[PDB]
Amino acid sequence: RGADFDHVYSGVVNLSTENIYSFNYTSQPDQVTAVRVYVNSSSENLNYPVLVVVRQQKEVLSWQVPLLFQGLYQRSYNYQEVSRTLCPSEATNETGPLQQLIFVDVASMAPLGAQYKLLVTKLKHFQLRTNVAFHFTASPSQPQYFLYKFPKDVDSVIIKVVSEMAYPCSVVSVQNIMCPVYDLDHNVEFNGVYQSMTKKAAITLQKKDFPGEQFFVVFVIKPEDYACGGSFLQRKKNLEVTIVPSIKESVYVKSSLFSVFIFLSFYLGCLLVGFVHYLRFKIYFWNIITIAVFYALPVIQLVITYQTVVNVTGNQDICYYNFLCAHPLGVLSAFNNILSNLGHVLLGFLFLLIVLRRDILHRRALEAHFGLFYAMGIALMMEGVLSACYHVCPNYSNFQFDTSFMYMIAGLCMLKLYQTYASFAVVIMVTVLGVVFVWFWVIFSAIHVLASLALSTQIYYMGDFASYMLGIFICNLLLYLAFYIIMKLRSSEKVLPVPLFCIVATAVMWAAALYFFFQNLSSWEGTPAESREKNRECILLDFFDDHDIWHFLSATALFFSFLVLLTLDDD
Amino acid sequence: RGADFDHVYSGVVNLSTENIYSFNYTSQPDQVTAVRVYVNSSSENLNYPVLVVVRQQKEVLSWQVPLLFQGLYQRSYNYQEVSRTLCPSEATNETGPLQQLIFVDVASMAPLGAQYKLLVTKLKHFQLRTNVAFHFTASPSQPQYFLYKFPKDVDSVIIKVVSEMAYPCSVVSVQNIMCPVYDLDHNVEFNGVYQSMTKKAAITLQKKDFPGEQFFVVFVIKPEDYACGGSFLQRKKNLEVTIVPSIKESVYVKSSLFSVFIFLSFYLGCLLVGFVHYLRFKIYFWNIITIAVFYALPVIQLVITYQTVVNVTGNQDICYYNFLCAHPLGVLSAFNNILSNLGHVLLGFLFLLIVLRRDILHRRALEAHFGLFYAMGIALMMEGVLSACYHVCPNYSNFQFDTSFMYMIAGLCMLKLYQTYASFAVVIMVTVLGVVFVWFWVIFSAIHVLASLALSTQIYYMGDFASYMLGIFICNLLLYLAFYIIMKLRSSEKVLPVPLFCIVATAVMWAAALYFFFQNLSSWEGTPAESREKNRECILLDFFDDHDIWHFLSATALFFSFLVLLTLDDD
Ligand SMILES: *[C@@H]1O[C@H](CO)[C@@H](O[C@@H]2O[C@H](CO)[C@@H](O[C@@H]3O[C@H](CO)[C@@H](O)[C@H](O)[C@@H]3O)[C@H](O)[C@H]2NC(C)=O)[C@H](O)[C@H]1NC(C)=O
Ligand SMILES: *[C@@H]1O[C@H](CO)[C@@H](O[C@@H]2O[C@H](CO)[C@@H](O[C@@H]3O[C@H](CO)[C@@H](O)[C@H](O)[C@@H]3O)[C@H](O)[C@H]2NC(C)=O)[C@H](O)[C@H]1NC(C)=O
Ligand SMILES: *[C@@H]1O[C@H](CO)[C@@H](O[C@@H]2O[C@H](CO)[C@@H](O[C@@H]3O[C@H](CO)[C@@H](O)[C@H](O)[C@@H]3O)[C@H](O)[C@H]2NC(C)=O)[C@H](O)[C@H]1NC(C)=O
Ligand SMILES: *[C@@H]1O[C@H](CO)[C@@H](O[C@@H]2O[C@H](CO)[C@@H](O[C@@H]3O[C@H](CO)[C@@H](O)[C@H](O)[C@@H]3O)[C@H](O)[C@H]2NC(C)=O)[C@H](O)[C@H]1NC(C)=O
Ligand SMILES: *[C@@H]1O[C@H](CO)[C@@H](O[C@@H]2O[C@H](CO)[C@@H](O)[C@H](O)[C@H]2NC(C)=O)[C@H](O)[C@H]1NC(C)=O
Ligand SMILES: *[C@@H]1O[C@H](CO)[C@@H](O[C@@H]2O[C@H](CO)[C@@H](O)[C@H](O)[C@H]2NC(C)=O)[C@H](O)[C@H]1NC(C)=O
Ligand SMILES: *[C@@H]1O[C@H](CO)[C@@H](O[C@@H]2O[C@H](CO)[C@@H](O)[C@H](O)[C@H]2NC(C)=O)[C@H](O)[C@H]1NC(C)=O
Ligand SMILES: *[C@@H]1O[C@H](CO)[C@@H](O[C@@H]2O[C@H](CO)[C@@H](O)[C@H](O)[C@H]2NC(C)=O)[C@H](O)[C@H]1NC(C)=O
Ligand SMILES: [Zn+2]
Ligand SMILES: [Zn+2]
Numbered sequence A, B: 001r002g003a004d005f006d007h008v009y010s011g012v013v014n015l016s017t018e019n020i021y022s023f024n025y026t027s028q029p030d031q032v033t034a035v036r037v038y039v040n041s042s043s044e045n046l047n048y049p050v051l052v053v054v055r056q057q058k059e060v061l062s063w064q065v066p067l068l069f070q071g072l073y074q075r076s077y078n079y080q081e082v083s084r085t086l087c088p089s090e091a092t093n094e095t096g097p098l099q100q101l102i103f104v105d106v107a108s109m110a111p112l113g114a115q116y117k118l119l120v121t122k123l124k125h126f127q128l129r130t131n132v133a134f135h136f137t138a139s140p141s142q143p144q145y146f147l148y149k150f151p152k153d154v155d156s157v158i159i160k161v162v163s164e165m166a167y168p169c170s171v172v173s174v175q176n177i178m179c180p181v182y183d184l185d186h187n188v189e190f191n192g193v194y195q196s197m198t199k200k201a202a203i204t205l206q207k208k209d210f211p212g213e214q215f216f217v218v219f220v221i222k223p224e225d226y227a228c229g230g231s232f233l234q235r236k237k238n239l240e241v242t243i244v245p246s247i248k249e250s251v252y253v254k255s256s257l258f259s260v261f262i263f264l265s266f267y268l269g270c271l272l273v274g275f276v277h278y279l280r281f282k283i284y285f286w287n288i289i290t291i292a293v294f295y296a297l298p299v300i301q302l303v304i305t306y307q308t309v310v311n312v313t314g315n316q317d318i319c320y321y322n323f324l325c326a327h328p329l330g331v332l333s334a335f336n337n338i339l340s341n342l343g344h345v346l347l348g349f350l351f352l353l354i355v356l357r358r359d360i361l362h363r364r365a366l367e368a369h370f371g372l373f374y375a376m377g378i379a380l381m382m383e384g385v386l387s388a389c390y391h392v393c394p395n396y397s398n399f400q401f402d403t404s405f406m407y408m409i410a411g412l413c414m415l416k417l418y419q420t421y422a423s424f425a426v427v428i429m430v431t432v433l434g435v436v437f438v439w440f441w442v443i444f445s446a447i448h449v450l451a452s453l454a455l456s457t458q459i460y461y462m463g464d465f466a467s468y469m470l471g472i473f474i475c476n477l478l479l480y481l482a483f484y485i486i487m488k489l490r491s492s493e494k495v496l497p498v499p500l501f502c503i504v505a506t507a508v509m510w511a512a513a514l515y516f517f518f519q520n521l522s523s524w525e526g527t528p529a530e531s532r533e534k535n536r537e538c539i540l541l542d543f544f545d546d547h548d549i550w551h552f553l554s555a556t557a558l559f560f561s562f563l564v565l566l567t568l569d570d571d
Helices: A249-280 A283-312 A335-339 A342-367 A372-390 A396-402 A404-419 A422-430 A446-460 A465-490 A497-517 A528-534 A546-566 B249-280 B283-312 B335-339 B342-367 B372-390 B396-402 B404-419 B422-430 B446-460 B465-490 B497-517 B528-534 B546-566
Strands: A008-013 A019-027 A034-040 A050-055 A060-065 A067-071 A075-079 A081-085 A098-108 A114-123 A134-138 A144-149 A156-162 A170-175 A193-197 A200-206 A214-221 A237-245 B008-013 B019-027 B034-040 B050-055 B060-065 B067-071 B075-079 B081-085 B098-108 B114-123 B134-138 B144-149 B156-162 B170-175 B193-197 B200-206 B214-221 B237-245
Touching: A008 A019, A008 A098, A019 A114, A034 A050, A034 A060, A034 A098, A050 A114, A050 B050, A050 B060, A060 A067, A060 A081, A060 B050, A060 B060, A098 A114, A098 B098, A134 A144, A134 A214, A156 A170, A170 A200, A193 A200, A193 A528, A200 A528, A214 A237, A249 A335, A249 A342, A249 A546, A283 A372, A283 A396, A283 A404, A283 B283, A283 B396, A283 B404, A335 A546, A342 A372, A342 A546, A372 A396, A372 A404, A372 A546, A396 A404, A396 B283, A404 A465, A404 B283, A422 A446, A446 A465, A465 A497, A465 A546, A497 A546, B008 B019, B008 B098, B019 B114, B034 B050, B034 B060, B034 B098, B050 B114, B060 B067, B060 B081, B098 B114, B134 B144, B134 B214, B156 B170, B170 B200, B193 B200, B193 B528, B200 B528, B214 B237, B249 B335, B249 B342, B249 B546, B283 B372, B283 B396, B283 B404, B335 B546, B342 B372, B342 B546, B372 B396, B372 B404, B372 B546, B396 B404, B404 B465, B422 B446, B446 B465, B465 B497, B465 B546, B497 B546
Parallel strands: none
Antiparallel strands: A008 A114, A019 A098, A034 A081, A034 A114, A050 A060, A050 A098, A067 A075, A134 A237, A144 A214, A156 A200, A156 A237, A170 A193, A170 A214, B008 B114, B019 B098, B034 B081, B034 B114, B050 B060, B050 B098, B067 B075, B134 B237, B144 B214, B156 B200, B156 B237, B170 B193, B170 B214
16 A cells, blocks of 8 residues: 555554555655654553564564563553654665665454554654754653764764653663664663663764764663662653764863873972072881782772773763763773872872981981871872772772772771770771661761761870761861961960961862862762763863862872971971 | 465565465463474575564564674674574463464565575474473574473472584573563573573572563574684584472581581591690781781672672673582572682681690790791681682682782781892782783793792792692692701601691692692683583582582691691600
8 A cells, every 4th residue: 555654544453454554755865864653552452462564675673562561570561652763774876866665564463453543754853963952752662763974074972962850761872874773672782882861871982983984873761760760651751962072182182281280380399499498508118018009909900891891892881980071092981080190199209209308308417207107198199099990980899999998008007006996996887887778877977976086086195988087087187287286376386487388278278179079970879870960061171070170189188288297397 | 375384385575475374273271382483585685685574463573584693893694594483372271272373474575586485383392391301403593492390399490501512602591481582682681591601501590580480491592703702604503401400408408517517527626635635644916907807898899799780680691600510599699619618717717726725835834936827827717708709709800809918918928028039029020911911921931930949949048820829839838848857857856746647638638639629610711601611510419519629628738737837846
């Protein structure tokens, strides 16, 4: 039967009859066209569904209406409206216009008869445009996919998908041109890069991965929200896809020089105040760096295999990146998260150089206190190193390594103190019970405030859970630095200007750094799709987000606070 | 057109014609029947394939002949013979016999005509039997699957699949009864437990996971061997599946008592030789166990998430178990690999008790050497602990943690020695270059023999890469123990019988343990399917394989060698 596009054909089919519709159209040698088939079925006899077969020249598609989805815990769903977009065949200049035939066979084995409505339309918005937002609606029975063609100048693009509602849970996938196109829930993650989303998604692609310099962007809606962060007629989802070009290679070399020349200006400070003085005229140390080298050896090998699993598969749900500001460089998918830790490592070498100069000049004056300062600058290096391997592929498992090492350092430091205790030990053991799981949480914060009071009093007599350590790192040291400002003012002592600049710089840097610490852009505490809802763009030279600025400012704030403790003893 | 089973129908189809065959049969209320459809296509015009649609009452299947597979690096394959087994509908006593209809629509859009051969048979060997080997042949275009029904007494089964040839690479999957059955390469790993095999495979199932107490065993042949350990008309594979019942709960409690009462008999030895004597009438220590606790904290959390990823998915290719002797217990998939390390931990507590008794009696005699012996017994505990967390889910990543810690211990021990060197340092750095990659390998073994000679000479003056450390652990200590046997014999010294029994027990235990060490049953150095080829059955009470016996004997051999070093100084 000859049939026309954009016309709703209705009919009744049963065991003896079988309706066959023939659709005839042509494809232009430059324009690319796609055909979408809509089938309805008002008959709710689930034992006798409507079987629809779509035949092309090189492909056959088949589905049953109403669609059935087997949910978890013995749940089933029906979908009376099923839609599908056929795989387009692109005509070139070498072939000219191409005539194409589509046969749509609608049949059923019902004894009485099943009603159905068939509508076949052409898609006028199949091809996506650069920097143009496109709005569309998808459904678990009605998947959608579109085509993007790479321009000649553009070498890498970012696909930004944004939705205003969290549910239903969706899947965005990028696939090749060659038919078939896997747009069903059981084969969408078979090949190509894919992501899971609730509100936001971001996929970064390169031109060299696709031989035709084009790809399909497949949008599949899941029938249940168990894979995302949730549970449980139609689950219609409104989406908005925008494809933007990535930054050029000049932004890479401009931001790399900013991350070096800022912290090399700190090296100019020591060589400038060392010129003022010209114008004014071990085994236990080596023991703490073999532990750090042998601790850091498996965690580099752990996250390298995490990165290569992501690269050779399409599973971008393993690493918890900030995908809106993840700029790749070769194997690394987020080079900006590694580059901002370079200044954190380097600045510790300046502090180790400063305490070396103080130790040699004290030993030279001895011819005519400095031990833990070496370990304080060593921990500045290794945490910047461990943050770099954490940011190769951030995950729930990798966070239990870069913080546990620092906890171990604190433990060994207490042993040295004891050489010249239980309330701090329950604190380490209460927080691992919260990993397992009203009575627990009222003492979870009660012992943390008591231990914060039990750190400040012992220093006074000597005169996530990592954020809770960082909570007391700001709170107790603010009073601990302020204890000798009022003690030296009351006694016969004066504050030199060189500590005075370092005290006021430590206060303003920790005020600025703690603001950027609370701007969480990702979280492994929930599902990977829930982590993507908090992603944000780059706010520094289109290369650094809020968390990468925190890596810069906490490097300065740790350095200036450590320089305060080296000073204030010149009287 | 009415058609009969077991008859090869041939025909020519083109654009105008479309052959439709109707197949009519009945299903018995106790016997379960399955229908297999074979389609050939001798026409090699790839632009106009033969499109076959199989319609049932509740399901529609469609495929094109010849089948096309898109390989890696732009490779394509054709398959002129395509076979498929339709999803069976089981008739019960409540429904009686059921009449069923199958329509097979064969069509093509070729202008001239395409030849095809259709054959539809019933399967007389669809249901599998317990403890009965079944032989069958599969192909990438001809997947096969069978049905197993759980007996009332059996609560858990093991599916043992064995093939005589490594290639082609195959996939074995276990799925639910409910249609559709995913037997294609793009959806076989969508749900249910699946495994990848080349020669052997073993899937362990429980009755409580399947609500119908039955399952489908799907066999899918991959078109390429890149997922397995290899590369690159038909790729026919001969397989053999046997379903065996698992061991009862009595074997669990019998083998658990064997692992305890053997090593508790070692505790009876100290309480027996302590009765003979009745008838004859710190801070640095605490520093080494906080490093071990903080090192062991993330690796338990690393492998627990590895186990839960395996459990909630079907991916059994992550953990490198010995699947022929992997006995689950709750969350753990291989409980026998955890249980054999219990005696390795416990036996170290006896050695720590022995050196405590020697230290107290020496201190009591002081009123009227023992430091590293505490650390030697501590490393006996922690390596048995670290082998247990390694065997929760063995992997390439987890091996770089349980060996690196021991390497770190050796490093810190050298610091104590230095307190009272470069050739040992290149050895640690050469072996990590072999992870990256003729000139390298001739010095890889040359520096290892030289360093083995450079360990023995320094002790003489005081009077995988983990297997290479274990290579010198046997070789250098054999001469190092033999150095004072000939020295005491030449000088005026006699060997007491209590060391003498311990020397001859150390030699026979290390001879027995090294035999079981070289029986490798798994290897993460290759693909997961290549690791499964070396799996073996349990050789000790149907609960312990060769590697679990190695955990028993090396625990005794380390204990008796450590007891030798405590003795031989009574003169
Ligand atoms: C496939 O064939 C078509 C048909 O010739 C090609 O389209 C043609 O492309 C050229 C190159 O850009 C166009 O010439 C340009 O025309 C504009 C005015 O439209 C003029 O301002 C430029 O200076 C230039 O001369 C040409 O107009 C265009 N033809 C049509 C009908 O639009 C197409 O490029 C071919 N594609 C491939 C991949 O070979
Ligand atoms: C299959 O059944 C569905 C659901 O009954 C049909 O979708 C419905 O289509 C009509 C006409 O396209 C929509 O009516 C229009 O709605 C808009 C927005 O409310 C309104 O501005 C218009 O004046 C008009 O009333 C209707 O909303 C829509 N229903 C839903 C739930 O989306 C569909 O057309 C049927 N046929 C096929 C081939 O899918
Ligand atoms: C579905 O209906 C069939 C038909 O009745 C049931 O098969 C029947 O099962 C009973 C129970 O085992 C059989 O009785 C046994 O017969 C053997 C001799 O064959 C005798 O030695 C035993 O002592 C016992 O009496 C009965 O023979 C068998 N009928 C036939 C025709 O084989 C079947 O159990 C029903 N299934 C369900 C799930 O209800
Ligand atoms: C589609 O084409 C294939 C391949 O041409 C056909 O398979 C062939 O089937 C014949 C008859 O079943 C087999 O011949 C028999 O071979 C055995 C073992 O060599 C021999 O003992 C017998 O005397 C007989 O000659 C033939 O081996 C087999 N070819 C292959 C490669 O397996 C198939 O029958 C065709 N039709 C369908 C519906 O699949
Ligand atoms: C449903 O099946 C019935 C028979 O099972 C068929 O009804 C026929 O409809 C055609 C025209 O639509 C006429 O020949 C008669 O009204 C019916 N013939 C017979 C022999 O029953 C038909 O296949 C289906 N009915 C529909 C679509 O209305
Ligand atoms: C699809 O429609 C086109 C018309 O748009 C048909 O093309 C016609 O074909 C006949 C015979 O081949 C010619 O005599 C006409 O001149 C063609 N029309 C045009 C506008 O070129 C085409 O045949 C149709 N497809 C099928 C399968 O019938
Ligand atoms: C291939 O297509 C041709 C037409 O394109 C058809 O050949 C017809 O075959 C039938 C019987 O097989 C007879 O009516 C004539 O021999 C042909 N008729 C016409 C109008 O050409 C047929 O569809 C196919 N040929 C086969 C299967 O042999
Ligand atoms: C499939 O075959 C069976 C026979 O094995 C057909 O059953 C017959 O149905 C007619 C009318 O319904 C009865 O008069 C006969 O007595 C039945 N035969 C038997 C042996 O019971 C059945 O109709 C066939 N299916 C179809 C769709 O025609
Ligand atoms: Zn960070
Ligand atoms: Zn082991």
